[PDB]
């Protein structure tokens, strides 16, 4: 559980960087990483960025 | 060194499937029926050492073992052109040749009778294998020979090679069709028990689905064993293409399946092949796009498993892997994945991250492909549990009537009780529930001590 | 010949003039839920993916210039764009063009526009005034 | 994605119509009898996915369901070259093969017996549709299978698929000919009952009108079933042209039918075809203008509906949709509408605004058209009630005589009473009156 929570935090930070990344491919990689929206369902920060920037 | 794979063809159906698979692999890799590389097999890019051994500097011999409890199928194989592909020292044949009498328990007992010979063959092949990964079993689960011999082989592989993986391509009885073999549900139950206890991976091949695929794609009203075997050979070719067309990733079977089996219990895989075409339609090379490929993959008509329409359970895909062969543009793959996600064409597991994996593969250069692009789908889909749940329901329907069980009671595996059938039913129930759970967030705790 | 002026015009008709009506019908049928979202709630990447998926899944995939079709998010809603256009022939054109985007979260239907990438010298024909019109 | 349409062909007449329709669509799209696109079929401008499915990247399979309660016709169809066009998984066949015996009640009972098979076929075909709008049933109202089984299927589709559109291609019995089918009024009544309660759109195909058109317009002294089926296939082709010739407008069925059905009750559609030509008159490609086209279309001799001369009711058009196919000049269309208004060639509803919609359509590129311009008329005209009124009068004539009712009382659907037939007759009378009322301003309160 601790490892999973760390992983989810790291993934959220990676998604934040991707949204701030210039590379579109990194954004597509982030989009692929959460195809089942598991992290988006689990990490609220991933829910807010797409709602706020769009 | 390649991870060598021993191919096990079990019983009449399994042995026919193995023979046709080896024929197809030889044709795709340019291997002669004697095990010699054909002059057209100039693409030295294939990993023969995974599935074939070299007999000489030129001849690659398949690492395939044909095992049956009935001599008829083995004798028919030995009269085929592929008789020279297998190492004869790796071939163990039951002396009685009588088969199991369509009894899985009898097949297990027959395997026990040839246990010494079988494990000697296995050890000889292991010594002939530089880096043997494990065994691939081709069998039917409904009969006696392929089913019982499969259960025996699974038990003996677990005992002898407890650190090696054992995957099977096991033809499962049709669970939606009422078997005329009243003990077919009993044989299938004993085989499912052994797969639960002694096999590590069972690829379920439902003869109902085989007949349906032959009907819809081959336009065969009554699918012959030969048509099912040819579809299986095409599937095996596609599964071995990554060994035959080496690339950056997933160049070996263990690399391919590692991503596919998240938990030891979640080892039930669904398969897909694309494009499905009739032999006559080779003429028009359709410029199929990665998006077009993915769209065709989502069609149930192309899925090699006939799951019933369960209206009560929201069956879902746990994971999907698409192995695509041919000319693929990475940007086309990216756009295809984007469109698939945007269209929500696949439901993924709710308890963890899940996606449709896409593999791009080269075609064999030695085998002329009539299609610019081909594709395999590997998927974990909860509707595959419906095949297992239906098999369990059929077993319970037969077991509750004790129909045709007296033939199994003659064999030691079923002589005293049918506990293997009850354990198979319980395991299939847990599998169905987990597949249903895998559509739900509570799959995170499914099967956790805290199915 | 080299700038395919007639081909460019036919492409504009097919896409900008919605000549491929079945493609647009399919695209709108699929995308209405996303266009129904508030402008702030629209995911541009999601709209772009839906656009490309409608393009490839419709007969618009048969358009050789379909790859020149781009998605444009209008800075004004359809109502605000309409007000700007109604002002275009009026001295209010500058006032409606300079009118701040309507704080009302425009539906994707109101923000939806196409863009078309025209290179020189073909960009000589689809000018910014022509493209805007 | 296109809104796929499943075509259900019911009974002898319905199955013949469906088969000829699929043949015509294949010919128009350059599709081989096996469902593979012919090399000459390079015009990818048709929207097959509305009516056809792609089996592969190259093979288009019709989204067609061939349904019969008698095996003879299905076996005869399966012996044609087009056996491979339809998806076999969308084909439900009644195990008994006995048909309905031209009995609607028997057709309904057979549908009940094959209910599971039919709904399994329907679901299998439904999963193959990306954006299924609904099911289209092609059947006859005079027989047993297409009438009875068709009504059963309509009822079960309405119960199971309440969010899907239901269009029907319903062949109505000849109302001007004394039907040899003494139970045709019973069959017609049951079909009208289901159309009132369970259908969303009824396209009336009057065999009397088909025979009249073949005699007067096709110069066919004895119209064969085959010639009627080929005319029906031409009509269906014209009805599907907007799917087969994609354009700016009317690209969907709901867009097509919205203009015909102003209110949910006003869902009884009449059809018209143009140009109407005798088989011999193909030779002269007449440069017909939109005004000239509409004028010939406005001629009852070219109208695909044989309405009786009602002297008592000032029948009028409730609504008109003109689908024109071929090379059309917009200025000619404008002049045609102008001339129609100036000449008062169409009377519109008095209770609301009503007009003739005009659609210009391209012809199929794969089939060479001998005519520069073709046209479909869709019209709501109160004189179509005269066909319905004539059918009702024939029903009342049989019911008042209780003719052949003992055979229906032999069947469970009609064993205890014929109350469904009497309610159907009353509803059809109200329908005739409403169609007559729809010519009047008081139609706003008609039926209140």
Swiss-Prot record, chain A:
- Subcellular location field: Cytoplasm, Cytoskeleton, Microtubule organizing center, Centrosome
On the tree of life, the source organism's domain of life is Eukaryota
As annotated in Swiss-Prot or TrEMBL, what is the tissue specificity of this protein? Answer: Ubiquitously expressed.
Q: How does it assemble?
A: Component of the gamma-tubulin ring complex (gTuRC) consisting of TUBGCP2, TUBGCP3, TUBGCP4, TUBGCP5 and TUBGCP6 and gamma-tubulin TUBG1 or TUBG2. TUBGCP2, TUBGCP3, TUBGCP4, TUBGCP5 and TUBGCP6 assemble in a 5:5:2:1:1 stoichiometry; each is associated with a gamma-tubulin, thereby arranging 14 gamma-tubulins in a helical manner. Gamma-tubulin at the first position is blocked by TUBGCP3 at the last position, allowing 13 protafilaments to grow into a microtubule.
Q: Which family does it belong to?
A: Belongs to the TUBGCP family.
Purpose:
Component of the gamma-tubulin ring complex (gTuRC) which mediates microtubule nucleation. The gTuRC regulates the minus-end nucleation of alpha-beta tubulin heterodimers that grow into microtubule protafilaments, a critical step in centrosome duplication and spindle formation.
From the Swiss-Prot or TrEMBL record, give the protein name: Gamma-tubulin complex component 3
- Protein species of origin: Homo sapiens
Gene name per UniProt: TUBGCP3
Span within the full-length protein is 848 to 901 of 907
From Swiss-Prot, chain B:
- Spell out the post-translational modification annotation for this entry: Phosphorylation at Ser-131 by BRSK1 regulates centrosome duplication, possibly by mediating relocation of gamma-tubulin and its associated proteins from the cytoplasm to the centrosome.
The record's subcellular locations are: Cytoplasm, Cytoskeleton, Microtubule organizing center, Centrosome; Cytoplasm, Cytoskeleton, Spindle
Cleaved signal peptide residues: none
Which molecular-function annotations from GO does this UniProt entry contain?
GTP binding; identical protein binding; microtubule nucleator activity; structural constituent of cytoskeleton
Residues bearing Phosphoserine? Answer: 131
Read off the InterPro entries from this record. Gamma_tubulin (IPR002454), Tub_FtsZ_C (IPR008280), Tubulin (IPR000217), Tubulin/FtsZ-like_C (IPR037103), Tubulin/FtsZ_2-layer-sand-dom (IPR018316), Tubulin/FtsZ_GTPase_sf (IPR036525), Tubulin_C (IPR023123), Tubulin_CS (IPR017975)
What are the alphabetically sorted keywords of the record?
A: Cytoplasm, Cytoskeleton, Disease variant, GTP-binding, Lissencephaly, Microtubule, Nucleotide-binding, Phosphoprotein
- Indicate which residues the UniProt annotation says bind GTP: 142-148
Q: Which GO terms describe its biological process?
A: cytoplasmic microtubule organization; meiotic spindle organization; microtubule cytoskeleton organization; microtubule nucleation; mitotic cell cycle; mitotic sister chromatid segregation; mitotic spindle organization
Q: Which Pfam families match?
A: Tubulin, Tubulin_C
Spell out the PROSITE patterns in the cross-references: TUBULIN (PS00227)
* UniProt xrefs under SUPFAM superfamilies: Tubulin C-terminal domain-like, Tubulin nucleotide-binding domain-like
Q: Which disease is it linked to?
A: Cortical dysplasia, complex, with other brain malformations 4: A disorder of aberrant neuronal migration and disturbed axonal guidance. Clinical features include early-onset seizures, microcephaly, spastic tetraplegia, and various malformations of cortical development, such as agyria, posterior or frontal pachygyria, thick cortex, and subcortical band heterotopia and thin corpus callosum in some patients.
Give the record's family classification. Answer: Belongs to the tubulin family.
Supply the name of the protein: Tubulin gamma-1 chain
Where does this protein come from, organism-wise? Homo sapiens (Human)
Lineage of producing organism:
Eukaryota, Metazoa, Chordata, Craniata, Vertebrata
UniProtKB/Swiss-Prot annotation, chain C:
According to the record, mutating residue 111 to P results in:
In CDCBM15; uncertain significance
| Residue span relative to the full protein | 505 to 637 of 902
What illness does the record link it to? Answer: Cortical dysplasia, complex, with other brain malformations 15: An autosomal recessive disorder characterized by global developmental delay, variably impaired intellectual development, speech delay, facial dysmorphism, microcephaly, and varying degrees of cortical malformations including pachygyria, thin corpus callosum and subcortical band heterotopia. Most patients have generalized seizures.
Q: What is the name attached to this protein's record?
A: Gamma-tubulin complex component 2
User: What is the tissue specificity?
Assistant: Ubiquitously expressed.
The protein's organism comes out as Homo sapiens
Instruction: Tell me the function of this protein.
Output: Component of the gamma-tubulin ring complex (gTuRC) which mediates microtubule nucleation. The gTuRC regulates the minus-end nucleation of alpha-beta tubulin heterodimers that grow into microtubule protafilaments, a critical step in centrosome duplication and spindle formation. Plays a role in neuronal migration.
How does the record describe its quaternary structure? Answer: Component of the gamma-tubulin ring complex (gTuRC) consisting of TUBGCP2, TUBGCP3, TUBGCP4, TUBGCP5 and TUBGCP6 and gamma-tubulin TUBG1 or TUBG2. TUBGCP2, TUBGCP3, TUBGCP4, TUBGCP5 and TUBGCP6 assemble in a 5:5:2:1:1 stoichiometry; each is associated with a gamma-tubulin, thereby arranging 14 gamma-tubulins in a helical manner. Gamma-tubulin at the first position is blocked by TUBGCP3 at the last position, allowing 13 protafilaments to grow into a microtubule.
Family designation: Belongs to the TUBGCP family.
Location in the cell: Cytoplasm, Cytoskeleton, Microtubule organizing center, Centrosome
């Amino acid at each position: 559980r601790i490892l999973t929570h760390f992983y989810q935090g790291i993934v959220q930070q990676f998604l934040v960087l991707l949204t701030t990344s210039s590379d579109e491919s990194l954004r597509f990689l982030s989009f692929r990483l959460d195809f089942n929206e598991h992290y988006k369902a689990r990490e609220p920060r991933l829910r807010v960025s797409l709602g706020t920037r769009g | 060194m390649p991870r060598e794979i021993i191919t096990l063809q079990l019983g009449q159906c399994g042995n026919q499937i193995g023979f046709e698979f080896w024929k197809q692999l030889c044709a795709e890799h340019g291997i002669s029926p004697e095990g010699i590389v054909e002059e057209f097999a100039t693409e030295g890019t294939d990993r023969k050492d995974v599935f074939f051994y070299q007999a000489d500097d030129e001849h690659y011999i398949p690492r395939a073992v044909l095992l049956d409890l009935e001599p008829r199928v083995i004798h028919s194989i030995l009269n085929s052109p592929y008789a020279k592909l297998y190492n004869p020292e790796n071939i163990y044949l039951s002396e009685h040749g009588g088969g199991a009498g369509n009894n899985w328990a009898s097949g297990f007992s027959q395997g026990e009778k040839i246990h010494e010979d079988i494990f000697d063959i296995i050890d000889r092949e292991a010594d002939g294998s530089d880096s043997l990964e494990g065994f691939v079993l081709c069998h039917s689960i409904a009969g006696g020979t392929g089913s019982g011999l499969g259960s025996y082989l699974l038990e003996r592989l677990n005992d002898r090679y407890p650190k090696k993986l054992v995957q099977t391509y096991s033809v499962f009885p049709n669970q939606d069709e009422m078997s005329d073999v009243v003990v077919q549900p009993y044989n299938s139950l004993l085989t499912l028990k052994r797969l639960t206890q002694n096999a590590d991976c069972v690829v379920v091949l439902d003869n109902t689905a085989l007949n349906r695929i032959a009907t819809d794609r081959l336009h065969i009203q009554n699918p012959s064993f030969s048509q099912i075997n040819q579809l299986v050979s095409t599937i095996m070719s596609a599964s071995t293409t990554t060994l035959r067309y080496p690339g950056y990733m997933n160049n070996d079977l263990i690399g391919l399946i590692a991503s596919l089996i998240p938990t030891p219990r979640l080892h039930f895989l669904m398969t897909g092949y694309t494009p499905l075409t009739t032999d006559q339609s080779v003429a028009s090379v359709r410029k199929t796009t990665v998006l077009d490929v993915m769209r065709r993959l989502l069609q149930p008509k192309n899925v090699m498993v006939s799951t019933g329409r369960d209206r009560q359970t929201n069956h879902c895909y746990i994971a999907i892997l698409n192995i695509i062969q041919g000319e693929v543009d990475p940007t086309q793959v990216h756009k295809s994945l984007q469109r698939i996600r945007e269209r929500k064409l696949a439901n993924f597991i709710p308890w963890g991250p899940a996606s449709i994996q896409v593999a791009l593969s080269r075609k064999s250069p030695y085998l002329p492909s009539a299609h610019r692009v081909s594709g395999l789908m590997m998927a974990n889909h909860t509707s595959i549990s419906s095949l297992f749940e239906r098999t369990c329901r059929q077993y319970d329907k037969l077991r509750k009537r004790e129909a045709f069980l007296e033939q199994f009671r003659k064999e030691d595996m079923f002589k005293d009780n049918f506990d293997e059938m009850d354990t198979s039913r319980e395991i299939v129930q847990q599998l169905i529930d987990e597949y249903h759970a895998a559509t739900r967030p509570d799959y995170i705790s499914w099967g956790t001590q805290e199915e | 010949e080299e700038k395919e002026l007639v081909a460019h015009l036919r492409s504009i008709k097919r896409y900008f003039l919605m000549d491929q009506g079945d493609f647009f019908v399919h695209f709108m049928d699929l995308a209405e839920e996303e266009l129904r979202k508030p402008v702030e709630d629209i995911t541009p990447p999601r709209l772009e993916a839906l656009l490309e998926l409608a393009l490839r899944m419709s007969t618009a995939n048969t358009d050789p210039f379909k790859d020149d079709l781009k998605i444009d998010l209008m800075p004004h809603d359809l109502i605000t764009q309409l007000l700007r256009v109604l002002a275009i022939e009026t001295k209010q054109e500058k006032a409606m063009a300079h009118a701040d985007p309507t704080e009302l979260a425009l539906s994707g239907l109101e923000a939806f526009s196409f863009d078309y990438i025209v290179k020189w010298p073909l960009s000589l024909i689809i000018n910014r005034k022509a493209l805007t019109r």
